[PDB]
Every structure is written in C-alpha cells, then in structure tokens.
Amino acid sequence: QIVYKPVDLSKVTSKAGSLGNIHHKPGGGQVEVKSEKLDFKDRVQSKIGSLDNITHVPGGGNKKIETHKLTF
Amino acid sequence: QIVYKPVDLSKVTSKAGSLGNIHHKPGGGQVEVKSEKLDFKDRVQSKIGSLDNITHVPGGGNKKIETHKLTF
Amino acid sequence: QIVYKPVDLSKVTSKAGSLGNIHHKPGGGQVEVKSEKLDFKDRVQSKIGSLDNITHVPGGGNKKIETHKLTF
Amino acid sequence: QIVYKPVDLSKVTSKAGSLGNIHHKPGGGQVEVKSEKLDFKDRVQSKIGSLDNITHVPGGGNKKIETHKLTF
Amino acid sequence: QIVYKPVDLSKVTSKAGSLGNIHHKPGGGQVEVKSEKLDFKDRVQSKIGSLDNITHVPGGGNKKIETHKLTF
Amino acid sequence: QIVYKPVDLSKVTSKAGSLGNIHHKPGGGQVEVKSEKLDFKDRVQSKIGSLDNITHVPGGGNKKIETHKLTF
C-alpha cells in the first residue's frame, strides 16, 4: 500500500494581513527646462528635468509557498 | 494499492488580506520646456520635461502556491 | 505500507501582520534646468535635475515557506 | 502789470520708468478642510483653509497732477 | 510789475528708474485643517491654516505732483 | 518789481535708480492644523498655522513733488 494524504486544514481570518486605505495626493509643483545642442548615442537612458511621484504597493498579504514529494 | 488524497480544506475570511479605498488626487501642476538642436541616434530613451504621478497597486491578497508529486 | 500525512493545522488571526493606511502627500516643489553642449556615448544612465518622491511598500504580511521530501 | 507763465517743458523718454513683462504662474496645489460646530457673532473676519497667490502691481504709468491759482 | 516764471526744463531718460520683468511662480503646496468647537465674538480677525504668497510692487512709473499759487 | 524764476534744469539718465528683474519662486511647502475648543473675545488678531512668503518692493520709479507760493 502507498497512501498520500496532505491536509492543509488552515485559517487566516479577521483582518489578518490587510493594508489600510492608499491615498496618493500630490500638491502640484513646477518644472522649467532649456536644452540646446545635446546629443545621445547607443543605449542612453536620460531624464533631464523631472518632478516625479511614485506610489508602488505590490505588498501586504498572507503569502504561503509549499512543496511536497514522495519518490522511488 | 496506490491512493492519492490531497485535501486543502481551508478558510480565508473577514477582511483577511483586503485593501482599503485607493485614492489618487493630483493637485494640478506646471511644466515649461524649450529644446533647440537635440539629436538621438540608437536605443535612446529620453524624458526631457515631466511632472508625473504614478499609483501602482498590483499587491494585496492571499497568494498561495502549492505543488504535489509522487513518482516511480 | 508507505503513508504520508503532512497536516499544517495553523491559524493566523486578528491584525497579525497588517499595515495601517498608506498616505503619500507631496508638498509641491520647484525645478529649473539649463543644458548647453552635453553628449553621452554608451549605456549612460543619467538624471540631471530631479525632485523625486517614491513610496514603495512590497513588505508587511505573514510570509510562510515550507518543503517536504521522502526519497528511496 | 500782473503776469503768470508756469512752463513745464519736460521730457521723459526711452523706457524711463517702465515695467518688464508681468508673469503670474501658479503650480497648482492642494487644500482639505473639516469644520464641525464653529460660531461667529460680530464683525468677525475669518479665513480657515487657504492656498492663495496675489500679484499686485499698482505702480507704473505716467501720472501727472498739477494745480494753478491767482487770487485777490 | 509782478511776474512769475517757474520753468521745470527737465529730462528723465534711458531706463532711468525702470523695473525689470516681474515673475511670480508658486511651486504648488499642501494644506490640511480640522476645527471642532471654535467661537469668535467681536472684531476678531483670524487666519487658521494658510499657505500664502504675495508679490506687491507699488513702485515704478513717473509720478509727478506740482502746485503753484500767487495771492493778495 | 517782483520776480520769481525757479528753473530746475535737471537730468536723470542711464539706469540711474533702476531695479533688476523681480522673481518670487516659492518651493512649495506643507501645513497641518488641528483646533478643538479655542475662543476669542475682542479685537483679537490671530494667525495659527501659516507658511507665508511676502515680496514687497515699494521703491524704484521717478517720483517728483514740488510746491511754489508767493503771498502779500
């Protein structure tokens, strides 16, 4: 007899891994740029005048990773 | 006799991995740009004058990854 | 007789690994840039004039990793 | 003999008291206000939540004022 | 014989009392206000939450004032 | 014989009392205010939470004032 019974009888409850509200509220801002003879070759990545706001939220939560084997 | 019975009887309840409200409210802004003789030749990525707001929310939740094997 | 029975009878409850509200509130700002003869040749990564705010939240939570094996 | 000859032979030339260009360029902005039980009774002047930009240029120009009399 | 000859043979030239360009460029901003039970009774002047920019230029120009009299 | 000849042969030239360009460029800012039971009774002048920028330029220009009299 070969018998294989992985259960995972599990509970994740009552606000266990939440985030709150997400508010992104920029207060305006000002930018001015003057550029003349500028010259770019192979694979240049350039950002000359910037006023930049990022809210990035890949997180929170109840991440579970599991693996089983049984091998002959 | 070969018998395989993985169960996964599991419970994720009551705001367990929720997000709140998502609010993005940019307060306007101002940008001015002057460019004269510029020249770009190969794979150039450029951003000269910018006022930029990004809200990115790929997260939250209860991500579960599970794998089972049985081999001869 | 070969018998495999991993259980994982677990409980994660009541704000166990939650984050509060996420507020990103930039207070405006000011940027000015003047560029004359600049020249970039190979794989150059450049950021000349910037006022930059990043809120990055990939963390928080109840991360669990587990692995089981049985081999002959 | 009574005689009265006030002349004023005067010259005001070539940008003598001029202004340049006037530019008013607000970069946006953000305001939030919550008021519950407030009460005002007599000649009250109030400004609770404000984001305000004033450009006031009451000068410039060629205003001339002159008055003449001769009395017995 | 009574005679009165005030001349004022005067010259005001070539940018003599000029102002340059006037630029007012607010870079945005952020304000938040919460008020519960406040009470004002007589001639009260109040400014609770403010982000305020004033550009006031009452000068410049060619203002001339003159007065003449002759009395018996 | 009675005579009165004030001449005023005067010259004011070539940037003699000029001002340059006037630039007012606020760099944003942030204000937060919380008020519970405050109470003001008579002629109160109040400023609780403020971020204030004033550019006041009352000079410059060619202001001339003159007065002449002759009395018996």
Side-chain angles (χ1 to χ4, degrees), chain C:
Chain C
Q1 180 185 61
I2 308 298
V3 47
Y4 191 98
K5 304 184 182 183
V7 186
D8 192 350
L9 171 59
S10 61
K11 184 179 297 180
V12 183
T13 76
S14 192
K15 304 177 183 178
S18 63
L19 304 184
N21 302 316
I22 296 164
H23 293 76
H24 184 198
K25 291 165 66 176
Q30 178 144 180
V31 182
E32 177 176 342
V33 183
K34 304 184 187 182
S35 296
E36 204 181 292
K37 304 191 173 78
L38 61 84
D39 180 345
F40 303 158
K41 304 304 192 196
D42 177 8
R43 283 165 285 177
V44 176
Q45 183 178 151
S46 181
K47 187 174 179 175
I48 299 185
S50 60
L51 174 46
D52 177 358
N53 307 292
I54 302 179
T55 300
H56 180 36
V57 188
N62 302 294
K63 185 168 64 178
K64 178 180 169 180
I65 302 176
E66 191 170 357
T67 70
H68 306 94
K69 311 181 198 290
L70 205 175
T71 303
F72 296 85

Side-chain angles (χ1 to χ4, degrees), chain E residues 25-63:
Chain E
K25 293 167 66 173
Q30 178 143 180
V31 183
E32 177 174 342
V33 183
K34 304 186 187 183
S35 295
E36 204 181 291
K37 302 192 171 78
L38 59 83
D39 183 345
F40 302 156
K41 304 304 193 197
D42 178 7
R43 281 164 285 179
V44 177
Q45 183 178 150
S46 181
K47 187 171 180 173
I48 299 187
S50 58
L51 176 46
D52 179 358
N53 309 293
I54 301 179
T55 304
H56 180 35
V57 188
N62 303 297
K63 185 164 64 177

Side-chain angles (χ1 to χ4, degrees), chain F residues 4-65:
Chain F
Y4 188 97
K5 308 182 186 183
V7 188
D8 193 340
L9 167 54
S10 61
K11 181 180 294 185
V12 184
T13 72
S14 192
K15 307 176 184 177
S18 64
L19 304 184
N21 303 317
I22 297 164
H23 293 76
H24 185 198
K25 292 165 66 175
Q30 178 147 179
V31 182
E32 177 176 342
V33 182
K34 305 183 188 181
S35 295
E36 204 182 291
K37 304 192 173 78
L38 60 84
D39 180 344
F40 302 158
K41 304 304 193 196
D42 177 8
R43 282 165 285 178
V44 175
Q45 182 179 151
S46 181
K47 186 174 179 175
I48 299 186
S50 58
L51 175 46
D52 177 359
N53 307 293
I54 301 179
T55 300
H56 179 36
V57 188
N62 302 296
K63 186 168 65 178
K64 178 179 168 180
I65 302 176

